Amino acid sequence: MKQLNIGVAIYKFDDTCMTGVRNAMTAEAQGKAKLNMVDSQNSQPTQNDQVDLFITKKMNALAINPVDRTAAGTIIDKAKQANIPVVFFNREPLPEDMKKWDKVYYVGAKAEQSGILQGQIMADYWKAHPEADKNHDGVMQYVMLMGQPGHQDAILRTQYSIQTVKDAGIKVQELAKDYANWDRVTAHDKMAAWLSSFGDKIEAVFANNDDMALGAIEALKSAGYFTGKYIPVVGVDATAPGIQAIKDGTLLGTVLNDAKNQAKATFNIAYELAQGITPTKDNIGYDITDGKYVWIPYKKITKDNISDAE
Ligand SMILES: *CC(=O)c1ccc2cc(N(C)C)ccc2c1
Ligand SMILES: OC[C@H]1O[C@@H](O)[C@H](O)[C@@H](O)[C@@H]1O
Ligand SMILES: [Ca+2]
Ligand SMILES: [Cl-]
Ligand SMILES: [Cl-]
Ligand SMILES: [K+]
């Protein structure tokens, strides 16, 4: 067969979710196309250099997980000039940037949905457990661990999780919120400081992803929770360690971020484009929305259906 080369840039390799995505992409590509996969080390200048090299090396298609998703416009400019099609994934280009060229696609998921499902987990717990309102004021005191500033999943999961709790008829009070950039250790450090400041005032913890929820859980353990003393913590992704924390009883719930189907859709699009074929639902195996987007559903995960994540 003809060798097809796809340039793949991952925003950083030390991201738990994106490790799942790139491993699944590598599995899908086996026997079909050569992935030239690089680590952008959470640096857009690094990724810009990598994209330039992909283009110089005449990749047949690009699959880019952009560090700064607002940089997708400049990446599209370069790709258009080189006539190399590009699919973006997981970090979403701005909608007007997507209209710059007709060989540009995006694969991801509707972050609003993951926020809603998060909020439902917490609201349902709150309604079933009167003891959760530790200061008996009829208000849920919570803290919020956000992802990276400006990332669409951080913006939308933060907004929709809490709006969903309010929509469920529950009054809320935000004690603290901060960016922990999807990182376990940073979330741990933020949560530890909050526990020193506010202590038993905290009644609920929301995190935009599992790694941050897990860091929060470690700070909570250190402060005496989850032995004997309980607090509900919710995340997003249903990674292997997230699933383990659900089983341990330390994570109340999460939302499956379907890396396997996002990887398949991304690969399939890049593979068709590498062959000079326009993606269709028939030839990539997924619905295409607004001519450019493939949205993969999120799914609620608690101890009640932990096998749905496995
Ligand atoms: C990218 C993402 O969110 C995600 C979700 C789940 C997930 C699970 C696993 N295993 C169960 C091994 C690996 C990666 C992964 C990533
Ligand atoms: O872009 C990276 C981020 O993507 C999000 O969709 C995932 O939930 C996070 O775990 C990940 O760090
Ligand atoms: Ca309260
Ligand atoms: Cl930690
Ligand atoms: Cl799917
Ligand atoms: K406990």
Author numbering: 1 to 228, 230 to 311
Q: What did the authors write?
A:
We determined high-resolution X-ray structures representing the ground states of the two major spectral forms: the glucose complexes of the Blue ttGBP.F17C•Badan and Green ecGBP.W183C•Acrylodan conjugates. D238 lies within the C-terminal domain and forms hydrogen bonds with the glucose 2- and 3-hydroxyls. By contrast, the dimethyl amino (DMA) groups of the fluorophores in these two structures point into solution and are isolated from the surrounding protein. For instance, the D238N mutation in the carbonyl hole of ttGBP.F17C•Acrylodan improves color switching from (ΔλB=−15 nm, ρ*=0.03) to (ΔλB=−29 nm, ρ*=0.21).
We installed thiol-reactive derivatives of the naphthalene-based fluorophore Prodan into bacterial periplasmic glucose-binding proteins. Glucose is bound at the interface between two domains of ecGBP. Glucose binding stabilizes a closed conformation in which the sugar pyranose ring is sandwiched between two aromatic side-chains and surrounded by an annulus of hydrogen bonds between side-chains and glucose hydroxyls.
